[PDB]
Amino acid sequence: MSKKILIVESDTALSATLRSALEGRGFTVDETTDGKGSVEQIRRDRPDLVVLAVDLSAGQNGYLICGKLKKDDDLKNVPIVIIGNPDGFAQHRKLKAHADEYVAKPVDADQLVERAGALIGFPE
Ligand SMILES: [Cl-]
């Protein structure tokens, strides 16, 4: 009865750290550095939770990707945790297309594991 997480994050060092911690708890975890294809990957692979960074590579932006996901009638139900500079969190919460949760960088991997479990439950 696997719980699946996708990390959209071009900081591969951080993504690996987060992945190991989540996998340690029993989550299945995939990673992508590509924000451009992220929405369609989410539609294909159907993760139970998305961890989405703000500052992504090749001009991609987590708030904009979150916008597309939360305006999509099919995908707006998939929980999104935004990670990044906490400065912009308060503003984005006010938007209709806000994420489900916001975790400030520096992200504590153990803390994120607990926040993931609060959103989608823990592996059993
Ligand atoms: Cl970021």
Author numbering: 1 to 124
Describing publication, verbatim:
The Myxococcus xanthus FrzS protein transits from pole-to-pole within the cell, accumulating at the pole that defines the direction of movement in social (S) motility. The N-terminal receiver domain (RD), a 258-residue coiled-coil domain, and the extreme C-terminal tail of the protein are all required for the dynamic subcellular localization and S-motility activity of FrzS. Here we show using atomic-resolution crystallography and NMR that the FrzS receiver domain (RD) displays the conserved switch Tyr102 in an unusual conformation, lacks the conserved Asp phosphorylation site, and fails to bind Mg2+ or the phosphoryl analogue, Mg2+·BeF3. The crystal structures of the mutants suggested that the observed conformation of Tyr102 in the wild-type FrzS RD is not sufficient for function. These results support the model that FrzS contains a novel ‘pseudo-receiver domain’ whose function requires recognition of the RD output face but not Asp phosphorylation.
To explore the potential for intramolecular signalling, we determined the crystal structure of the FrzS RD in two crystal forms, a hexagonal form (P63) at 1.0 Å resolution and a tetragonal form (I4) at 1.9 Å. After several rounds of refinement using data to 1.0 Å resolution, this structure was used to solve the tetragonal form. The FrzS RD structures in the two crystal forms were very similar, but the overall Cα RMSD for the structures of 0.57 Å was above the errors in the coordinates. The largest differences between the structures in the two crystal forms occurred in the conformation of the β3-α3 loop, part of which was modelled in two conformations in the hexagonal structure. Excluding these residues (54–62) from the comparison reduced the Cα RMSD to 0.45 Å. Although the backbone conformation was very similar, this molecule was poorly ordered in the present structure, and virtually missing from the electron density when different cryoprotectants were used (N. Echols and J. Fraser, data not shown). Even in the relatively unconstrained tetragonal crystal form, FrzS adopted approximately the same structure observed in the high-resolution crystals.
